[PDB]
Write a protein that binds this ligand. Structure first.
Ligand SMILES: O=C(CO)[C@H](O)[C@H](O)[C@H](O)CO
Ligand SMILES: O=C(CO)[C@H](O)[C@H](O)[C@H](O)CO
Ligand SMILES: [Mn+2]
Ligand SMILES: [Mn+2]
Lengths: 287, 287
């Protein structure tokens, strides 16, 4: 068991272009990501059964584009649950997601894979956390057979009760104790929870395996409150060489299964291409 | 008719010291605010029927302290509801809170007074917004007879679907069209939703009636990401002369119902006096 190769590469989140993964939606997102000049598309596998693999393989080939995958779990698939029937549903979704990612020749399963994405009605018990750590052990081991790293995305208090800072994320990963399990940081969530935009990156070092770039309000990069200068300087200091996906959500493009959960009440952009294009330039200028 | 006098004065949120307003909790919080050097205490009126008003007035006299009030409504008192019985409950609580604030000699009712504080399942309908605007018209007119201004606190996407930016708040206040209705900004909520920390303040000018100071993670002022230098520069430029309350919420002090609502999963402070004391020094040094 070991970590699978990572490279400095730039990706666009599928929801920048498409709210579904129909033949049309898949192509819109892949074509968009390719058009803006990204190395990969990040597919939202919130329902990995809805994904036509052959179709997707063909599109990625057609546009000379690589794929990674992210998801959140839901109440019905929450691996922190003290109901083992719900944890089993979680393990199953995570296996299927991995199977799909393997069929597409992808190497990264990231996002909120360790709990239900959304507002918890109270703080996590030690048992909620232990349930989550075990589930990520079973996932990392399943993934390892298929040349896939998992990257646990730290998100803000409103989207998980398990880990809200990189430091918390790192301590969680110590317990997972798997070589193909990494920290996933997102500048949007960091903007809320972190003591500056450097502390968690510098602590993480080689354990930082994935990055999401989002503005404070998840709109155009450079129109919000995120100190990107301080963040990217930290990446340079640890010489980060892994996926970097631009992520943004507008009511304009809505997945029913994500948009209400992320409380995307506001339209912060309408031109996917203009947003994605400016974002990659903004990112590449700094890293 | 008219708006009531505002002065530049510094406030401590009662919830920094006490989770309740028992005689002991009230005494503790008022003595705390006075000890830290604040001009007033901001009393949480989530349940204004549970306040002993004569006791509170005696305490405020005893410690030579003024009082303003903030609250959030809940599902059962949501003035945005399409259930007129629920709106009626909201009107009733808002009237009661105004009565309490009036008897206490206060002039400012602020916070999430226009909707239920928390995660909405979907975006706000035209009805939801119109119901809210009408409720704030009835409240503003009721408060006008009692020399009280109302200030509508703009909160982040996870805490309301009605208004997430200062600009949205100003537009909502245009429809309310009451001289004693003002905008209320909170740096914690601005840190997520705003295009920088100056814009909403410069646009609001004389319509900014109330300010909450919160760090990005709601911990010690200056250990987070909020560009306070840029915010206070904006306050200076419009010569803001209104209440400035420091707030933060510890799961060790507040009611489990509120800490769960605000997703306080960790505590970045334990010493109420040290936090509140240092918070005021931080504020008074910049404004
Ligand atoms: O930031 C996120 C949600 O706020 C993550 O990117 C999600 O886990 C991922 O996009 C799943 O949609
Ligand atoms: O920022 C706030 C909520 O997060 C407001 O201060 C509260 O809604 C209000 O003070 C009630 O406690
Ligand atoms: Mn993300
Ligand atoms: Mn506030």
């Amino acid at each position: 068991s070991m970590a699978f190769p990572k490279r400095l590469e730039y990706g666009g989140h599928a929801l920048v272009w498409s709210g579904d993964w129909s033949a049309a939606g898949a192509r819109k997102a892949i074509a968009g990501a390719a058009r803006a000049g990204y190395d990969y598309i990040e597919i939202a596998l919130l329902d990995p059964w809805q994904i036509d693999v052959a179709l997707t393989k063909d599109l990625l080939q057609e546009y000379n584009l690589r794929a990674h995958a992210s998801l959140g779990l839901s109440a019905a698939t929450d691996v922190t649950s003290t109901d083992p029937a719900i944890v089993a549903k979680g393990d199953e979704l995570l296996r299927k997601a991995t199977d799909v990612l393997y069929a597409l020749g992808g190497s990264e399963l990231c996002g909120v894979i360790y709990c239900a994405l959304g507002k918890y009605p109270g703080p996590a018990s030690r048992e909620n956390r232990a349930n989550s750590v075990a589930a990520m052990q079973r996932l990392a081991d399943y993934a390892a057979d298929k040349g896939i790293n998992i990257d646990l995305e730290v998100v803000n208090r409103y989207e998980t009760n398990i880990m809200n800072t990189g430091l918390e994320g790192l301590a969680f990963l110590d317990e997972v104790n798997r070589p193909n399990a990494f920290l996933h940081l997102d500048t949007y969530h960091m903007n809320i929870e972190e003591n500056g935009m450097a502390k968690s990156v510098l602590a993480a070092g080689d354990r930082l395996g994935y990055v999401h770039i989002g503005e404070s309000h998840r709109g155009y990069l450079g129109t919000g409150n995120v100190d990107f200068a301080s963040f990217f300087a930290a990446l340079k200091q640890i010489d980060y060489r892994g996926p970097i996906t631009f992520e943004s959500f507008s009511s304009e493009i809505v997945d029913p299964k994500l948009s209400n959960t992320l409380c995307v009440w506001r339209n912060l952009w309408h031109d996917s291409d203009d947003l994605a294009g400016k974002a990659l330039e903004f990112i590449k200028q700094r890293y």
